[PDB]
Write a protein that binds this ligand. Structure first.
Ligand SMILES: Nc1ncnc2c1ncn2[C@@H]1O[C@H](COP(=O)(O)OP(=O)(O)OC[C@H]2O[C@@H](O)[C@H](O)[C@@H]2O)[C@@H](O)[C@H]1O
Ligand SMILES: Nc1ncnc2c1ncn2[C@@H]1O[C@H](COP(=O)(O)OP(=O)(O)OC[C@H]2O[C@@H](O)[C@H](O)[C@@H]2O)[C@@H](O)[C@H]1O
Ligand SMILES: [Ca+2]
Lengths: 1306, 20, 89
């Protein structure tokens, strides 16, 4: 950091008045002030010495000097904030490269994307509330998204205070958000209140500045919200306006000289904006607009804004100096009388020179019906300015569109950027696609899709990684991903602490969100140009669906690959996610989205069922390779997809599985009768489908296929279980002995067979899963719980019967076992049509009848202890009185002594016969009211797993299931679902199936959107848009002067000239206030040029409009008038008397040659524009001109005036040969407009044009070899010609005049 | 009403050398 | 001047069942979540003693609307920064 504190006194300077030139007008209590009077009795910070000449009116160029700067550093305001702010005091003239290097390196500010420079009224500013509203939302909203750089004046007063407050509260209300809208303020060092505390000679790395709004006379104090501060010094003290040229010069160098990413350059766009102002504002706008930054003014705002906005669409000649003060004094009605005529003519000149350049200006218009934003204005003010500034620029085409993404302006970007003239390739829209996605903008991604971006080519692997790196941090999924990634333990060695984000991490959280049964989606690498995944659009759908982005996901579902899996997976994820949300507004939308996706899955499948049913059944049993090797049906099962499974065709598929190999329509009684007899099935007793078994009767195959059906195995297990119960009841009633019988041992054998069947029910693993999770999914089952409780009670009872000493214990234990088996048979009635729905309600009401019965138990216990205490003697018996009163309480609960008996019986009658019955009535009303009619769908959803469990089971009744257990146990001793519920199809088959599917989806979508067009709200919206188009359709029913001469800021000479309007230009019109300074250059009293810059002496005697020897002082146009022995401009008035930097008075004759040639293609034919052709000129660029210009020289020598342009450029001896070849064609001669024109010393030219018609070998060969170009110049090169090509505008007039001689384009 | 206004917008939108 | 002016004007406009006037001057209030609940409490305590069959329904529905306004502000301030929003209660 100390490199900065060493670097600033090395680098930057600051101004110093060195001599006491005591002011005539003594200041207000500053009577000792030497025309600046900074800090002394003098204007001196040293000895106010004579310095060998006490020069009266000490020149700011000559008196004031530069000194190394030490006043830099950091700052904090005393108690007003807590953060620190950087600040630098800087010289008046400083190279902007220095300041940019400072702000980049030693302050740590990266390159921006937008530069808003806001300007307005400082001390006397008043605003209506409507104007105040735009600053709070419009400026902050457009600043905060793009990552702007708000640059403004640093002051606590007026508009800068409004920007300072409106950016502060955003930082507080952001709730610890990352990033701050960076703000840089620039003010003059002279008009600072307490800056004497700021000057520290060493590096003031801490500092304290206390603001005080009391001592503000001439000066003003800083604002406390700006994040960086720049203080331009001038050496003066109370001057206002030494910050405008530095800000304007710096803004351009930042915008157009720093970003060159893949090409020549790319300019960071830049907008100046105004609110309300005065004389500082007009000078700022006028100095800005000459540098190419556009300016938007806001209507209905203030004084200067309205007087600019009224004169917007007016022609330039229509401005009258009367009209200016007329419109001025009404809006400036407070200080309207404070205006003088010189101020009126200055403001008229400035408003004239501003509204000339109609490209670089826009009005906001204050449309005030929507009062939309600043953004709609700023975008058009970018686009009009960008086209005019350059036509070959490509940075604006891709840099601008991205900005147009971030404010959601699709009509603008469609109409303006996507008209023509870009010639883009589609893949070039890839990065600006990405930020349209992260910022959740559906309209722009729909427009990019309709313009031709391919999703399947777009989603690379690293692109997907970057997509997951920038999730919305407000969502739940981001918090869960962070809780996983922070708890990621296997990342030991890296440069940082937080390692990375890998795809297996989000795969790992997705597997835990989705369920155990799927495989991991993304693999972990066990370790190019473009790495692709197995299916791209799946991944983008997952990303867009975890963040609850609705309208984005609805778009990208339409391009999906295999849709019925996709809609169900996205329903499952949303239902599993909406439970853990814990926000009362997110959960409702996150649920309704899942319901909509259930609707989409049903809508596609009901089409594919109607087209071809038997192919559509193959769609459910497919195993999807995309979603982690699962099927569609199990995915719909786990998501509780209630409305999906109750569809007709899927229930038909379930029934067709259920009736097995044989047909589905032969009823149940015939099934029982063929179950009764073996050869009745061998007779023509039953049905069959797949008639090769029905016609060709092979009775062994028919018996095997009859026994394979799961209904048969169901009825066989029911019959065997029934006989098991009956013989168990007989051996429990009378046949019980301490010695085991034989009817007993057979029954124990059948129950061992049952427990081994339940063992293989638990241990079966078709796919690998959690074995503990396998046990959990087992024990979650109700009937599994009942079955295992029965078998544990049975083995405990057999242990007790093995004890002969507890026989009557053990025997009755085997009674209770029996009771459990009875409820098992109620399981049968789940398969009925009409009973199962009732069983559902019983399983419902168990849950609360339990917790009611506990309360009943506490009540009857209280009653029993009360009755035992009131109505007995004092007794502690073991089982006489306690069991007697317990039997009396059982007789009461199952169904003088006068007053006490009446009180006891009435208390019992009022309590235990009344109120808890009403609790039951209310609780079971609240229970049975809730069930409603959903119960049929609950049963239809409940139908599946029974068919599953019986399909997996072997065929034998359980006395013979050991015959099945032995073969399977010896096959799994040595070393897979059935292929009717999950099968991996042929690849060649699956391609045809998926193509059929993706055909049918587009047929669904048209009916969907078409019937969505018939809702009434859509019709009302369409009628309103119709009538608004109707009301729009029904509502639908200058003087050419030397304007480059009158322009201010005489080049390379810091002087000024007088404001001259469009009225008082020529010598015919009288201008009574016309008093131009007799201005001469420093080199106007010099060598071979005429010494008549000070021609008040009689030295002015040279020839006027005649050749005074070598000085051909005679115009090509005509004879100039002479007044007071000096020539006047024949064109009019310029505003500056004298010679200037020109050689002599009158015209200074010069020759401007131009070379022209044709621009050929790769073949050699002429390249073609829309109509005309392409032209090339050879131009020069000097090292300190920063501009291309024509190689034209002053015609002070005769023939070597092109060599006076191009002795060092062209050649030495071959230059005279090409000068002999320079006999060409003349286009224009005479007076030329130029900024180096006074009223006396103007420029006249002759313009010759030489040409190359053939672009092979001829005259051009001599131009090639005769080139020694590298003499004292930077660069020369040939160049394409177009109207936007860089050059001096004066030379651009020559090219636009000489382009008609060959028919090139424009 | 929609058919009326569409007829309305339609109505408002409504407002060589002879050789051988 | 009083301690807080706009409180007093809100009370005056809310005791008289002036609906659209109170809806305007709520928007300039100082501390809003207290204000909407106080104006709900006053309306519920007042609508019991009204004994006019048309005044009581509107005087109740206004209190329900102010409950909605209090919920609507607080659910914003909860979503921006939770641990500061607990300090508001
Ligand atoms: N830099 C300044 N800081 C504070 N007050 C100022 C400044 N410059 C002028 N003033 C005061 O403002 C009063 C006039 O203000 P306006 O005319 O409303 O504003 P204007 O003079 O047009 O100033 C435009 C100001 O915007 C800034 O971007 C720029 O620094 C320029 O000074 C004058 O009395 C003057 O004392
Ligand atoms: N018609 C014009 N349009 C724009 N700029 C002009 C024009 N005429 C002159 N200038 C500018 O005025 C400045 C002074 O004019 P001259 O020095 O007389 O012009 P010239 O001799 O052609 O240029 C000399 C060059 O040498 C370098 O030292 C210096 O940077 C300058 O670019 C130059 O920087 C030039 O860019
Ligand atoms: Ca079981």
């Amino acid at each position: 950091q100390e490199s900065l504190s060493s670097w600033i006194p090395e680098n930057i300077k600051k101004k110093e008045c060195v001599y006491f030139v005591e002011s005539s007008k003594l200041s207000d209590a500053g009577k000792v002030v030497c025309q600046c009077g900074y800090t002394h009795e003098q204007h001196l910070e040293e000895a106010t010495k004579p310095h060998t000449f006490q020069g009266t009116q000490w020149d700011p160029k000559k008196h004031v000097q530069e000194m190394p700067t030490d006043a830099f550093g950091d700052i904090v305001f005393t108690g007003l904030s807590q953060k620190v702010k950087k600040y630098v005091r800087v010289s008046q003239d400083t190279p902007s490269s220095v300041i940019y290097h400072l702000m980049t390196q030693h302050w740590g500010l990266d390159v921006p994307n937008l530069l808003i420079s806001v300007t307005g009224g400082a001390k006397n500013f008043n605003m209506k509330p409507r104007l105040k509203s735009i600053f709070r939302r419009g400026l902050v909203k457009v600043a905060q998204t793009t990552g702007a750089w708000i640059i403004t004046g640093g002051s606590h007063t007026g508009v800068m205070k409004q920007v300072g407050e409106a950016v502060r509260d955003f930082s507080l209300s952001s709730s610890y958000k990352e990033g701050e809208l960076i703000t840089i303020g620039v003010a003059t060092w002279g008009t600072v209140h307490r800056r004497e505390g700021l000057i520290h000679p060493t590096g003031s790395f801490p500092a304290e500045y206390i603001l005080d709004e009391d001592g503000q006379g001439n000066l003003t104090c800083l604002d406390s919200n700006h994040s960086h501060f720049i203080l331009v010094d001038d050496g003066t003290h109370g001057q206002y306006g030494v910050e405008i040229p530095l800000r304007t010069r710096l803004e351009k160098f930042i915008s157009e000289q720093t970003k060159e990413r893949g090409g020549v350059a790319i300019k960071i766009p830049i907008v100046c904006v105004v609110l309300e102002g005065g004389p500082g504002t007009l000078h700022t706008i006028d100095n800005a607009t000459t540098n190419g930054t556009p300016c938007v003014v806001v209507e209905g705002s203030g004084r200067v804004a309205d007087v600019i906005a009224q004169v917007a669409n007016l022609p330039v000649s229509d401005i009258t100096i009367s009209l200016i003060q007329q419109k001025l004094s009404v809006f400036f009605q407070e200080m309207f009388e404070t205006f003088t005529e010189s101020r009126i003519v200055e403001w008229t000149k400035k408003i004239q020179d501003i509204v000339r350049r109609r490209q670089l200006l826009t009005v906001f218009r204050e449309g005030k019906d929507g009062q939309q934003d600043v953004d709609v204005a700023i975008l058009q003010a970018l686009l009009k300015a960008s086209r005019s500034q350059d036509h070959f620029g490509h940075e604006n085409w891709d840099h601008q569109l991205k900005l147009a993404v971030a404010w959601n302006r699709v009509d603008i970007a469609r109409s303006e950027i996507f008209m023509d003239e870009w010639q883009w390739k589609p893949s070039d829209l890839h990065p600006t696609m990405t930020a349209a996605l992260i910022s959740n903008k559906p309209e722009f991604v729909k427009l990019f899709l309709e313009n031709g971006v391919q999703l399947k080519e777009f989603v690379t692997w690293d692109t997907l990684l970057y997509l997951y790196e920038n999730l919305d941090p407000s969502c739940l999924f981001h918090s869960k991903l962070q809780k996983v990634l922070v708890e990621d333990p296997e990342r030991p060695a890296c440069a940082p602490a937080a390692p990375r984000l890998q795809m297996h991490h989000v795969a790992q959280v997705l597997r835990e969100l989705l369920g155990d049964f799927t495989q991991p989606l993304y693999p972990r690498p066990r370790h190019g140009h473009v790495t692709f995944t197995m299916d791209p659009i799946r991944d983008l759908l997952i990303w867009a669906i975890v963040q609850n982005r609705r309208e984005l996901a609805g778009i990208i579902w339409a391009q999906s690959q295999d849709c019925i899996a996709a809609a169900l997976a996205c329903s499952k994820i949303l239902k599993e996610l909406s439970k853990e949300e814990e926000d009362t507004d997110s959960s409702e939308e996150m649920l309704a989205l899942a319901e909509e996706y259930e609707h989409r899955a049903i809508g596609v499948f009901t089409e594919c069922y109607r087209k071809d049913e038997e192919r559509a059944q193959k769609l459910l049993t497919r195993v999807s390779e995309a979603w982690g090797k699962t099927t569609c049906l199990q995915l719909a099962l786990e998501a509780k997809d209630m409305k999906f499974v109750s569809h007709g065709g899927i229930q038909a598929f379930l029934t067709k599985v259920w009736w097995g190999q044989l047909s589905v329509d032969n009823g149940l009684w015939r099934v029982t009768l063929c179950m009764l007899a073996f050869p009745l099935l061998l007779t023509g007793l039953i049905s069959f489908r797949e008639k090769r078994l029905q016609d060709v009767g092979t009775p062994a195959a028919r018996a095997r296929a009859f026994f394979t059906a799961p209904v048969v195995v169901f009825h066989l297990n029911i019959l065997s279980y029934f006989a098991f119960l009956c013989l168990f009841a007989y051996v429990l009633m009378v046949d019980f002995q301490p010695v085991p019988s034989w009817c007993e041992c057979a029954i124990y054998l059948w129950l061992f067979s049952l427990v081994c069947e339940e063992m293989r029910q638990l241990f079966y693993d078709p796919d690998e899963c959690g074995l503990m999770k396998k046990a959990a999914l087992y024990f979650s089952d109700f009937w599994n719980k009942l079955d295992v409780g029965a078998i544990l009670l049975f083995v405990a009872g057999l242990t007790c019967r093995l004890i002969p000493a507890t026989l009557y214990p053990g025997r009755v234990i085997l009674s209770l076992d029996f009771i459990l088996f009875c409820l098992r048979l109620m399981h049968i009635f789940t398969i009925s049509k009409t009973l199962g729905p009732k069983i559902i309600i019983v399983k419902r009401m168990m849950k609360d009848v339990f917790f009611f019965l506990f309360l009943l138990a506490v009540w009857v216990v209280s009653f029993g202890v009360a009755k035992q205490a009131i109505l007995i003697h004092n007794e502690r018996r073991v089982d006489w009185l306690f069991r007697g009163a317990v039997y009396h309480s059982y007789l009461t609960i199952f169904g003088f002594p006068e007053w006490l008996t009446v009180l006891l019986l009435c208390l019992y009658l009022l309590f235990t016969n009344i109120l808890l019955l009403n609790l039951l009535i209310a609780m079971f009303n609240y229970t049975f009211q809730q069930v409603q009619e959903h119960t049929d769908q609950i049963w239809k959803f409940q139908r599946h797993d029974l068919i599953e469990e019986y399909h997996g089971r072997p065929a034998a009744p359980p006395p013979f299931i050991l015959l099945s257990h032995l073969q399977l146990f010896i096959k799994r001793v040595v070393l897979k679902r059935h292929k009717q519920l999950k099968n991996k199809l042929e690849k060649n088959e699956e391609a045809a199936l998926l193509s059929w599917e993706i055909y049918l989806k587009e047929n669904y979508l048209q009916n969907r959107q078409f019937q969505q067009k018939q809702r009434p709200e859509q019709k009302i919206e369409d009628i309103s848009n119709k009538v608004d188009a109707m009301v729009d359709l029904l509502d639908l029913d200058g003087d050419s002067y030397h304007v480059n001469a009158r322009h201010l800021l005489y080049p390379n000479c810091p002087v000024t000239r007088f404001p001259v309007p469009n009225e008082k230009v020529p010598w015919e019109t009288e201008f009574l206030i016309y008093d131009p300074p007799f201005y001469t250059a420093e080199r106007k009293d010099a060598a071979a040029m005429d010494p008549m810059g000070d021609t008040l002496e009689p030295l002015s005697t040279i020839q006027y409009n005649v050749v005074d020897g070598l000085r051909d002082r005679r115009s090509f146009h005509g004879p100039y008038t002479v007044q007071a022995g000096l020539p006047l401009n024949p064109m009019g008035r310029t505003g500056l008397r004298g010679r200037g930097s020109l050689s002599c008075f009158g015209p200074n004759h010069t020759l401007y040659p131009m070379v022209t040639r044709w621009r050929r293609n790769e073949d050699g034919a002429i390249c073609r524009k829309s109509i005309k052709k392409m032209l090339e000129v050879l131009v020069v660029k000097l090292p300190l001109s920063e501009h291309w210009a024509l190689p034209g020289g002053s015609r002070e020598p005769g023939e070597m005036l092109p060599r006076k342009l191009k002795r060092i450029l062209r050649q030495e001896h071959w230059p005279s040969f090409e000068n002999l070849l320079k006999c060409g064609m003349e286009v224009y001669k005479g007076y030329m407009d130029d900024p180096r024109n006074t009223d006396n010393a103007w420029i006249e030219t002759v313009a010759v044009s030489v040409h190359f018609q053939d672009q092979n070998d001829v005259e051009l060969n001599r131009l090639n070899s005769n080139l020694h170009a590298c003499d004292s110049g930077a660069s020369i090169r040939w160049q394409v010609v177009d109207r936007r090509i860089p050059l001096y505008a004066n030379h651009k007039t020559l090219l636009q005049k000489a382009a008609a001689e060959f028919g090139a384009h424009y």
